[PDB]
Structures are given as structure tokens and as C-alpha cells.
């Protein structure tokens, strides 16, 4: 409260270490489905379906331009990408699965850097 501050846990590295995590997201075989915007004109229902849209390349934008106050909004955006996969594609698909593999890869990543 007013004057009684909890300790000073090091963000510093966050950064660095989110830009490491996004690296290799980007850099797996499974990561084709997310790496650009799904393409509003061409995939009907997408555009209505999907309020938020996200991908790999617009988390990059985001990241190099500190769009991201802080590590915990970053983590927010690349489930996003993830729960919007879910919500569009059937689970026994190739997009469907490269969706469960890569939100297992990147949660794993997350807990071993930060928890």
C-alpha cells in the first residue's frame, strides 16, 4: 500500500528472454500455420468468427516497437494465437494439431524461463 512495496523482482532480461522465446516459436516445423495473418478476404467466416486476431509476425511488430508493457501481456497475445486456432479448426486436422503441439512447446519454454 502507500509506502509498503513488496521486493523488487528483476524484469530487466524480459525483453531479451521474450524476443528468445518468439525466435523459436518462429523457428519450429509446425509454426507455417502462424507465422503470417490468416487473410480476412479469402477465408470466409474467419473476419466475423474471430474477434482478435493474432499471429507470430504481428507478436515480432508488437515486440520490436514496445507495444508490450510488460511479459504477462506478451504471454496473453501468443495464447490468443492458439485459442484462435481451437476456436476454427477441427482438433483431428493438420492446423488443428500444429496448434496443440505448438501451445504445449511454447508453454513449456514459459514455465522453464520465468516460473
Same mark, same amino acid.
Given at each position: 500500500s502507500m509506502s509498503v512495496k513488496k521486493p523488487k523482482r528483476d !524484469?530487466?532480461?524480459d525483453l531479451a528472454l =521474450? &524476443?528468445?522465446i518468439l525466435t523459436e516459436m518462429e523457428?519450429?516445423? !509446425?509454426?507455417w500455420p502462424f507465422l503470417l495473418p490468416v487473410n480476412l478476404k479469402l477465408?470466409?467466416?474467419?473476419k466475423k468468427v474471430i474477434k482478435k486476431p493474432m499471429d507470430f509476425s504481428t507478436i515480432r511488430e #508488437?515486440?520490436? &516497437?514496445?507495444?508490450?508493457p510488460n511479459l504477462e501481456t506478451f504471454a496473453l497475445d501468443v495464447r490468443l494465437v492458439f485459442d $484462435? =486456432?481451437?476456436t *476454427? $479448426?477441427? !482438433? !483431428?486436422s493438420d492446423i488443428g494439431r500444429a496448434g496443440h503441439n505448438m501451445? #504445449?512447446? *511454447?508453454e513449456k519454454k514459459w514455465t522453464d524461463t520465468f516460473k
Open positions: !524484469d530487466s532480461k =521474450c &524476443s528468445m523457428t519450429h516445423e !509446425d509454426a477465408v470466409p467466416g474467419y #508488437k515486440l520490436s &516497437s514496445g507495444q508490450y $484462435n =486456432c481451437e *476454427f $479448426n477441427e !482438433d !483431428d501451445r #504445449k512447446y *511454447f
